[PDB]
């Protein structure tokens, strides 16, 4: 219902149409897709359009292609019992780390291994490891979510935000910014608690915007309705206040970190901001992407600068002493 | 009929092992980690300070060796009560949530235990790592720790199904579930030695780390002898006797150790100071793992093999997912 607060820069790679056409060929040829139907469903994610918003000035079209390919892959892979999923997640992650691993007729492994090959031809081994760790974090997230669903466990707010941080694919998505842009962010700059908090907050805002984008299971609305006793409308309102509050804290902490930041950390931070907006805008415009004018909230629904009560796993985002 | 371990590597133990052991035993009593005197005594009997004092035997700061040894105690305890025998040990759906909560607590100091006695203990370990290590070094441990839990989740998935993995899946799984990734990721935190990312993430050094982890995991399978281990894996997939399996396992573990040694000798000369200390750690830990395994209930002369049981310098047959360790062009 309520329009999205997102006062962040919107931009899209000028070569997005050229990257999309190469991506559509890669998808047709990959083996990822059994039937013509499934090729069309993956194409209809408009994943080039999504990631071209994340890295809108990427110098090398081929690096933007490679990173865009993983987004298609993630959507195809996400479209299994916990016991078999823990093994699949293990085998798929091994294939990302081990170029010698063999497919064993799993349709998703050669495809992932083709993306990994392209990442290893552009990226420093350091940037590839950052992606690998991000990819395992996402898989852990998915495993947690598949486990909760199989058991009929509706998690509380704390567990739900912890899990969604990972299961919504934001860690591997933001971990591709560097691979798309080129220059390596120094470990000292990327692993700073303040920058880790910016990354997780960008991820969390993108995940809650994706919860919103699918209202029409385990999402913020069911979690709040089950564990607080809310109507749907009361939960939509609470979810928005909560998300808007994480985003204010992101803007606050970004304005403290940005001034001192080196070239590469500065680029990465512009990426978080582009990605938050890009994800929101992509989710508004996706069914030929819709191009009718969009309305954006001028103001946050909740302007508190305090931690979310009921979500202690994210409270540390507000603890400047810790950062 | 189980043959001696081939391990021609430096055996060394920290001169202050007994002082660190004593502080570790005090911490284990205060930790709330152990439900009963019986479980305190079981954790103490892992001699985890003896174990990790062999991995960083010249660690300048005893507080760094202590913090590091604590996680080894914690891991043994967590694994015994939550991974290997807990109602979670065949309940993958529940383990996935626990893995998520425990891993979040390691990453987020603000996180709350929600009744899990393992969580406050790990958070104190993490607090020590954050006080000593760079945020980069702590991120390496955190990533390693998640890798380990992913492997345990795969193993518990297998158990629930009664699925006995083949060699390839078993090696890949056990690379993670034996806890070698977080164990070796604490080397740097014990020595103080921040290893530049360009040096640690080199494919060649990643291969050396994985091989050290793989040899120590196969040595643990040997120390611990339906159960998922290399002997059941070969018995099930190759229709071997236990005796033929024991000999097959020794062959393929020795052949991995020989590749570790060949690659180490090509990597070591070029290495800077911090990577050099890290590689000495891989070697000390392989040996430390094997010797701690043979001595843990102590001082009687050990016998080691003089020769590897197999010395093919080619990838292990039936294990494609590790064949890249022998690819010098990738490495």
């Amino acid at each position: 219902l309520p329009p999205i607060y997102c006062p962040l820069e919107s931009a899209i790679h000028p070569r997005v149409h050229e990257v999309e056409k190469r991506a559509v060929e890669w998808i047709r040829r990959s083996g990822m897709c059994a039937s013509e139907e499934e090729r069309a469903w993956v194409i209809a994610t408009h994943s080039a359009d999504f990631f071209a918003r994340f890295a809108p000035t990427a110098a090398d079209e081929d690096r933007l292609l490679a990173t865009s390919l993983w987004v298609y892959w993630g959507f195809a892979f996400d479209d299994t019992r916990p016991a078999q999923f823990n093994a699949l997640a293990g085998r798929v992650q091994r294939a990302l780390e081990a170029p010698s691993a063999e497919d064993n007729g799993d349709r998703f492994v050669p495809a992932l291994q083709d993306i990994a090959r392209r990442f290893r031809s552009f990226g420093t081994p350091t940037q590839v490891r950052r992606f690998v760790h991000a990819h395992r974090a996402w898989l852990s997230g998915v495993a947690w979510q598949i486990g909760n669903q199989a058991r009929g466990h509706m998690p509380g707010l704390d567990d739900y935000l912890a899990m969604r941080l990972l299961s919504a694919g934001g860690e591997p998505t933001f971990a591709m910014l560097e691979i798309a842009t080129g220059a390596e962010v120094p470990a000292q700059d990327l692993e700073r608690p303040a920058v880790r908090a910016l990354t997780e907050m960008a991820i969390m805002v993108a995940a809650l915007d994706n919860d919103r984008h699918s209202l029409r299971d385990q999402n913020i609305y069911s979690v709040l309705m089950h564990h607080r006793g809310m109507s749907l409308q009361e939960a939509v309102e609470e979810a928005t206040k909560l998300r808007d509050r994480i985003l204010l804290r992101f803007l606050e902490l970004h304005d403290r970190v940005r001034p001192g930041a080196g070239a590469e950390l500065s680029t990465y931070l512009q990426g978080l901001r582009h990605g938050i907006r890009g994800n929101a805008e992509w989710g508004l415009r996706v069914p030929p992407m819709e191009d009718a004018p969009l309305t954006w909230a001028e103001s946050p629904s909740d302007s508190s600068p305090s931690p979310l009560p009921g979500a202690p796993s994210i409270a540390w985002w507000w603890d400047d002493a810790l950062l």
Side-chain angles (χ1 to χ4, degrees), chain A residues 39-265:
Chain A
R39 291 208 276 283
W41 183 93
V42 167
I43 294 163
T45 62
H46 290 280
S47 290
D49 180 277
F50 173 91
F51 203 68
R53 294 160 184 281
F54 277 64
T57 61
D60 194 344
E61 268 165 72
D62 296 344
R63 288 169 174 259
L64 177 59
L65 174 54
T67 59
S68 295
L69 292 191
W70 183 80
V71 180
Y72 283 111
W73 186 91
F75 278 119
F77 182 80
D78 201 74
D79 195 64
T80 326
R81 302 314 295 161
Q84 288 79 339
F85 181 80
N86 290 9
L88 175 65
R91 272 184 253 112
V92 169
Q93 182 76 16
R94 181 63 181 164
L96 176 55
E97 302 205 34
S100 58
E102 295 189 359
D103 67 73
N104 251 244
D106 181 343
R107 272 168 18 260
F108 291 105
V109 160
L112 181 59
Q113 271 187 330
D114 197 85
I115 297 151
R117 200 182 39 64
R118 293 157 182 265
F119 290 7
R120 291 191 172 99
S121 76
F122 301 127
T124 71
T126 295
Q127 294 166 312
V128 173
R129 281 286 283 180
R130 286 164 184 171
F131 181 76
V132 163
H133 296 320
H135 196 278
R136 176 183 283 108
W138 167 62
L139 288 174
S140 293
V142 174
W144 189 347
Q145 190 182 82
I146 296 173
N148 287 349
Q149 131 126 45
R151 291 167 60 197
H153 181 81
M154 187 62 55
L157 177 71
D158 195 43
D159 280 348
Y160 176 77
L161 292 172
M163 173 192 77
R164 263 306 263 187
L165 208 40
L166 298 190
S167 77
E171 285 291 354
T173 307
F174 282 117
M176 289 196 301
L177 281 172
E178 275 202 270
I179 301 171
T181 61
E184 183 183 292
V185 181
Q188 185 182 27
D189 294 347
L190 187 60
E191 311 292 14
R192 258 172 80 185
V195 173
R196 207 51 219 141
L198 294 174
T199 304
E200 297 196 338
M201 281 191 278
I203 290 167
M204 189 79 263
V205 168
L208 295 169
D209 290 352
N210 292 336
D211 282 7
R212 161 186 213 287
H213 165 56
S214 44
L215 244 187
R216 64 316 111 48
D217 296 309
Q218 280 166 274
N219 51 63
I220 186 63
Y221 310 114
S222 315
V223 161
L224 290 172
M225 282 169 64
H226 188 272
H227 287 288
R228 299 206 158 154
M230 283 171 170
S231 71
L232 182 40
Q233 195 41 62
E234 285 164 309
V236 169
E237 285 180 23
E238 189 52 46
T240 298
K241 285 188 183 194
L242 199 137
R243 170 247 182 236
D244 287 346
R245 190 203 305 213
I246 296 159
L247 183 48
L248 289 177
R249 179 54 185 155
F250 176 85
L251 298 175
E252 182 182 51
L253 172 59
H254 175 284
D255 292 342
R256 181 163 77 65
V257 169
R258 167 61 181 90
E264 308 93 358
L265 176 58

